[PDB]
Amino acid sequence: GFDYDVVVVGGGFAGATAARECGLQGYRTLLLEARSRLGGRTFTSRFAGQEIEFGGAWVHWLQPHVWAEMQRYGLGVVEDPLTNLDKTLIMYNDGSVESISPDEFGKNIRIAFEKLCHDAWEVFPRPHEPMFTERARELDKSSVLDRIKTLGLSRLQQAQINSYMALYAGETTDKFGLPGVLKLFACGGWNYDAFMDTETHYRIQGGTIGLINAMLTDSGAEVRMSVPVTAVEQVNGGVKIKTDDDEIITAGVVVMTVPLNTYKHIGFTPALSKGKQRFIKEGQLSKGAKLYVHVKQNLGRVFAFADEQQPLNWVQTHDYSDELGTILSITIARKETIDVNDRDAVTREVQKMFPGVEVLGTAAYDWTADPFSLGAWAAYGVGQLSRLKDLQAAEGRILFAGAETSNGWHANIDGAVESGLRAGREVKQLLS
Amino acid sequence: GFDYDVVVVGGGFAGATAARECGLQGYRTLLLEARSRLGGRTFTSRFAGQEIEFGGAWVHWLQPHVWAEMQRYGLGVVEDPLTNLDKTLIMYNDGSVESISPDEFGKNIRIAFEKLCHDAWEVFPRPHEPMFTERARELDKSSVLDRIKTLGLSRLQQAQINSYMALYAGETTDKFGLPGVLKLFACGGWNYDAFMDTETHYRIQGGTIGLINAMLTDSGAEVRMSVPVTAVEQVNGGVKIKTDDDEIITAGVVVMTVPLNTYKHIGFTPALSKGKQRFIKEGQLSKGAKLYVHVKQNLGRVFAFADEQQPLNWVQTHDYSDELGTILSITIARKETIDVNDRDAVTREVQKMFPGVEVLGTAAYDWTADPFSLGAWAAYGVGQLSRLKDLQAAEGRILFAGAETSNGWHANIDGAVESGLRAGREVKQLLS
Ligand SMILES: Cc1cc2c(cc1C)N(C[C@H](O)[C@H](O)[C@H](O)COP(=O)(O)OP(=O)(O)OC[C@H]1O[C@@H](n3cnc4c(N)ncnc43)[C@H](O)[C@@H]1O)c1[nH]c(=O)[nH]c(=O)c1N2
Ligand SMILES: Cc1cc2c(cc1C)N(C[C@H](O)[C@H](O)[C@H](O)COP(=O)(O)OP(=O)(O)OC[C@H]1O[C@@H](n3cnc4c(N)ncnc43)[C@H](O)[C@@H]1O)c1[nH]c(=O)[nH]c(=O)c1N2
Ligand SMILES: CN1CCC=C1c1cccnc1
C-alpha cells in the first residue's frame, strides 16, 4: 500500500526506458531527476548561433536497443557528414605539432586500430556476454597500454592510437581496461569500417531529448525535476526514498540509474553488498570535458588528435564560414589538463595548434564538476569488467541500471537503453 | 463503437509484436490465427528426443528489433555447432561431391560472397533506407545471376555462392533480385563473417514459440485460433472482417500480417491500390522446405552446400554424440527437388551426400503446401525492392506488416518484428 509501484531515480536514457516499460505495464510510476533538465549525459544546447552537443548524441543501426526504439517512435537519422578534411594534425606528448596528409593519417589510424583489436573475435564471440570466454577474464588483467606496447607500431601510429584510447578512457591509457575496448569493437561486427561508422556519423532525428520525451510521454509516469535523491531504505516489503528537501516517497520497488560515480552521495540501508561497494568506491575512469571554441579565422575543415599529456585531445571543425570564422568541437580527456573556463589558457592551447587565431568565444561542459555525473562516459579500469555482474545484480527491492551496467555498448546511449529494458523486466518479476 | 479497437490477422512474429504494442497501449485487441497453432513461418516442434525449429530459428545481436525483444523478455542464445567444423562439402549440380578442408571452404565462400557484394558499401550505406542511393534502384534491374556471371569465379566458389543464393531465393538464382542480397549483407556490417554469423549460428532460448508466447501474454490480447480471415471491408469508419464460417468481427483498424503469397485468398472492399495488387499478384519467390534427419553414425560438426539442381542445399549439424548419432538440419531451396515426406528418397539423397550412413528418422515441413504460407521466407524477385513502398502503404484503416514489408532484415524474424513495431506506431497514430 505504498505511494507508487515503482520509483525511477534518474532522467537519462536508462531511467526513461525503465519508466516507459514500467508505465506500459500499468504500474503507478514516478521518475525523479536531480537536474532541472532531462537527458543526463546527453545535452543539446546552442553556441555562437548554432546547435551543439555537449554530451552523447550519436547512434547507429548496429546498436540494437536504441535502433529498436527509433523504429517504435518513427525516428530517422541525421548525418554529420564532414566529407573531406583540409588539415589533419597530431600533437605528441612533448607539445610538438605535426601536419599529416588526411590520407596518411587515416591509413595509420586504421593500421594501429586493427592491430589493437586483432583478436576481437576470439576473445568476444558474444560481445553481449563479455565473460563468455576465459581469454576475456585473463585479458582483464591487462591495460590498453600493456597491449599497445606489444604492437610494434610506428611513433605516429602509437601516438594516434594512444590519443584515441585516452579519449575512450577519459584517462591515461595505463589505467584503461583492455577488454572493454575489444568488446566494443566486437559489438560493431568485429570490423573496422562498420565500427568506425558508429562513432560520430548519425544523430537522432528530433534529438536525444526528443526520444526521451517520446518515451516518457508514452510511459504515463509522473516526472518530478530538481528532486535529487539522498537516501534509500528497504522496509515493510518496500522502499522509502528521501530527497534533499527531507521529503519521503514510498514504493514497492526503486530503479537506480544514476551514474556510478555519484553513488557516494546516497545513503543505503541496509548497506549494499560488498561487491557493489567496491564498485562504488572505485568509480569509473572517465574525467572528460567538452569545449566549443569560436575563433575569428575561417580554418576550414580540420581534425586533430593530441596525446594524453596534452589538453586538446580531440579537435574537429563543427562549422566554418568567412562570416562565422570557425567553431571547434573539442573533447578533453582529463579535465585537470586545462581550465576550460579560462579564456586565456584556452586561447594559448588553441594557438599551440592553430597559430595566430583569435578566440571570440567559448562554451564548455565539465562533466567531472557536475555533481550529478562526476565524470563522463563509461570507461572501465583494469579488472572491473570481469566483476561487472556485482554491479548489475539486484539488491533486494533496489534495482540498478545505467550504461555502466550494460553488457554491450556501455559507453553509449544504447547501453543505457539496454539496462532500462532489463530493469523493467526485473521490476515486473518482483511485482508480478 | 466496434467489437474491438484493433484486430491483428496473423499469429507470427509480426502479428505478435503488433498485438503486444497495441495491447500495452490499452487498446481492445484481438488476434486471429488461421492455423491451430501460433508461430506462422516459425514452428517449434520435437524430433528424435530434441527440440527443433521447422521454420525460422536463428537470430543475432546485430539484428536490432528481435535482440531488443530478447532483452525485454530475458532470453539468451543457444549455440548450434558451427564453429570448428569436422567436414565441409560441396555438391555440384551434376551430383559430384568435393570435400574441402574447412578453412579452405570458408576462405572460398568468403571470397565469392564478398566479390558478389563488393559494392555493398557504396550502394547501401543506409541498409534501412534501401532506395537511398540511385545505384540500388538501377541494380534492381539485375538478378543475382547477372552479377555472378561477371565475377570469373572458380568452380568451387561459383557453386558455393550459387547454392547460398538459391537457398536465400527459394528458387533458381536467375530469378533472384540482386539488391536485396546486397542490402542484407550491408545489414550484417558489410562483411561476410559477421553476416554469416547472423544466419545459422544462434537460436532463441526457450524457442521462437517461447518469444511469441511471451509477447502475446504480455499483450493481454484475446487470441482466437483456427479462425481464417477471408475478407475485409472498410465501412462505418472502421472495418468488418469475415471469417471462413458465419463469424463477422468489427474493429476500428485491422493489421494484416499474413504472408504476401496468401493475400490472393482474401477479398478487400474497397479494392487495394494498384501497386499493392501488383505485389499480391506477383508474390515472392521462395519455395523452400525444411528437413531434419537422424542418422545412427556420429558425423560430428558438418556443413555442406549443394547447388540449385540438387535437393540438400544447406546442411549443418543440429546435434551429435556417440549415443545419439547425428541430427542434420537441412534447408531445401525448392520443394520440387525432393519428396521430403518419402523417407526412402530422403535416405537415398542423404547417402548421396554421406555414403554409408543409416537413417533412423526424418521429419519435414513443406512450407509451399501449407495454404497459410504458400512459400517460405521472403525472397524478392527482380524489380520488387524498389517498389516495396507500394506494399508498405496503409490502405485507410487497414495496415500492412510482415517480414516482406520490412526495410532491414526482411528474410528474418527481425524484419517481422520491425514491421510489427511499425504497425503499432501506425495504429497509435490512427486511434490516438
Ligand atoms: C561528453 C560525452 C560524449 C559522449 C557521451 C557522453 C559524454 C558525457 N556518450 C555516452 C552517453 O551520453 C551515456 O552513455 C548515456 O547518456 C548514459 O545515460 P544513463 O541513463 O546511463 O546515465 P545519465 O547520466 O544520462 O542519467 C543519469 C541521470 O540521473 C540523474 N541523477 C544523478 N544523481 C541523481 C540523484 N542522486 N537523484 C536523482 N537523479 C540523479 C542525472 O542528473 C541524470 O539525469 C556518448 N554516447 C553515444 O551513444 N554517442 C556519443 O557520441 C557519446 N559521446
Ligand atoms: C523454413 C524457414 C526457415 C527460415 C525462415 C522461414 C522459413 C519458412 N526465416 C524467415 C522467417 O521465419 C520469416 O521471415 C518470418 O518469421 C515471417 O513472420 P511474419 O509474421 O512476417 O509472417 P508469418 O508467416 O510467420 O506469420 C503470418 C501468420 O498469418 C497467418 N495467416 C495466413 N493467412 C491467414 C488468414 N487468412 N487468416 C488468419 N491468419 C492467417 C499464418 O498462419 C501465420 O501464422 C528465417 N528467419 C530468421 O530470422 N532465421 C532463420 O533461420 C530463418 N529461416
Ligand atoms: C537465416 N535465414 C533467413 C532466411 C532463410 C535463412 C536460412 C539460411 C540458411 C539455412 N536455412 C535458412
Numbering used by the authors:
A (entry chain A), B (entry chain B): 51 to 482
Direct quotes from the study:
Nicotine oxidoreductase (NicA2) is a flavin-dependent enzyme that catalyzes the degradation of nicotine into the non-psychoactive metabolite N-methylmyosmine (NMM). NicA2 acts by degrading nicotine in the bloodstream before it reaches the brain. Clinical use of NicA2 is limited by its poor catalytic activity in the absence of its natural electron acceptor CycN. The higher in vivo activity of NicA2 is due to the presence of a cytochrome c, termed CycN, that acts as an alternative electron acceptor to O29.
Inspection of the solvent-accessible surface area in the crystal structure of wild-type NicA2 revealed several interconnected cavities that extend from the si-side of the FAD isoalloxazine moiety to the surface. One such tunnel is in a region that is rich with the mutations that we discovered that improve the oxidase activity of NicA2. We previously determined that NMM formed due to nicotine oxidation remains bound to wild-type NicA2 when it is oxidized by its natural electron acceptor CycN9. By contrast, the NMM-bound structures of v321 and wild-type NicA2 are very similar with an overall root mean squared deviation of <0.5 Å and no obvious difference that would explain our observed change in activity with O2. The addition of NMM did not cause any notable chemical shift perturbation in wild-type NicA2, although the peak narrowed, suggesting that ligand binding may restrict conformational fluctuations in the tunnel. The major populations of both wild-type NicA2 and NicA2 v321 appear less accessible to solvent when bound by NMM than when ligand free. We have succeeded in isolating variants of NicA2 that are much more capable of reacting with O2 than the wild-type enzyme (koxO2 of 28 M−1 s−1 when bound by NMM).
